[PDB]
């Protein structure tokens, strides 16, 4: 930041953005877990087929 007001601006912006990134990171990793288990539920039969 350039001034203390810009520090407040950038601090709020980074707080919001890192919170959003943490939210979507948790969500995307849980999504990988979900889709990977969805595939694994039948993949062995997929392999043999």
């Amino acid at each position: 930041p350039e001034t203390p007001q810009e520090r407040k601006e950038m601090a709020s912006g980074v707080n919001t953005r890192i919170d959003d990134l943490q939210m979507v990171l948790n969500q995307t990793e849980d999504h990988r877990q979900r889709v990977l288990q969805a595939a694994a539920k039948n993949i062995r039969v997929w392999f043999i087929k």
Binding site: R17, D20, L21, M23, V24, Q27, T28, H31
Partner: protein, 231 residues
């Protein structure tokens, strides 16, 4: 009523005769055989039946009397996933000319129909008509690359429709498609990040990933991933 294989070939012969005629082709839409024929083709791998259904498909798309008639038939085809089957059959090779020449013709015409549905005017018109129901424009990546800027037209009226539907759509399909298209806009047009933040699509999709329908949740997660493709 699940009649026998030879009988299937015979009745597809009859519908292929009807499709040969322009006016009889126009008449038979009152039944719409294509939803039945598309899936029954999955079992009827036999050359006889597969050939005759391909010929009937060509006859539909050839002798359809109007551009709207061709669009109706082709829409039935694509929404019942005939295009991927035509690509698979094109990879396949057969005894005589007709099967492969018809598959090639059908690929040509289905591709033309897909481009037409991918028209920017069609995208705007489906947004106006509420038809956010997986028309090929939605998944045609080339269209998105070419026309993502078109969502800025009329002062972002397309995005405004999408973001109003994100809180007005009773249909989960429409809601999910709205969230997904909002995400695709950010994916394909970098400045759209702040436009979506302004319109609330950011918040709307990041919330609707907790929507009551898992399909809407999934599409909203895809859209939020688009928004988070980078900073």
């Amino acid at each position: 009523n699940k009649c026998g294989f030879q009988l299937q070939y015979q009745m597809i012969f009859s519908i292929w005769l009807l499709a040969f005629s322009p006016q009889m082709c126009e008449h038979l839409r009152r039944y719409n055989i294509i939803p039945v024929l598309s899936d029954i083709l999955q079992e009827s791998v036999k050359e006889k039946v597969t050939r005759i259904i391909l010929a009937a498909f060509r006859n539909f798309l050839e002798k359809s009397t109007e551009r709207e008639t061709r669009q109706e038939y082709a829409l039935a085809m694509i929404q019942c996933k005939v295009l991927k089957q035509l690509e698979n059959l094109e990879q396949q090779k057969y005894d005589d000319e007709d099967i492969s020449e018809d598959i090639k013709f059908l690929l040509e015409k289905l591709g033309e129909s897909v481009q037409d549905l991918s028209s920017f005017d069609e995208y705007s018109s489906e947004l106006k008509s509420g038809r956010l129901e997986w028309s090929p424009v939605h998944k045609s990546e080339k269209f998105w690359r070419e026309n993502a800027v078109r969502l800025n037209e009329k002062n972002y009226e397309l995005l405004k429709i999408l973001t109003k539907l994100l809180e007005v759509s009773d249909d989960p399909q429409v809601l999910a498609v709205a969230a997904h298209d909002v995400g695709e806009y950010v994916r394909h047009y970098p400045r759209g990040k702040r436009v979506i933040e302004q319109l609330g699509g950011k918040q709307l999709v990041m919330n609707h990933m907790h929507h009551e329908d898992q399909q809407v949740r999934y599409n909203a997660l895809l859209a939020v991933q688009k928004l988070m493709v980078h900073n």
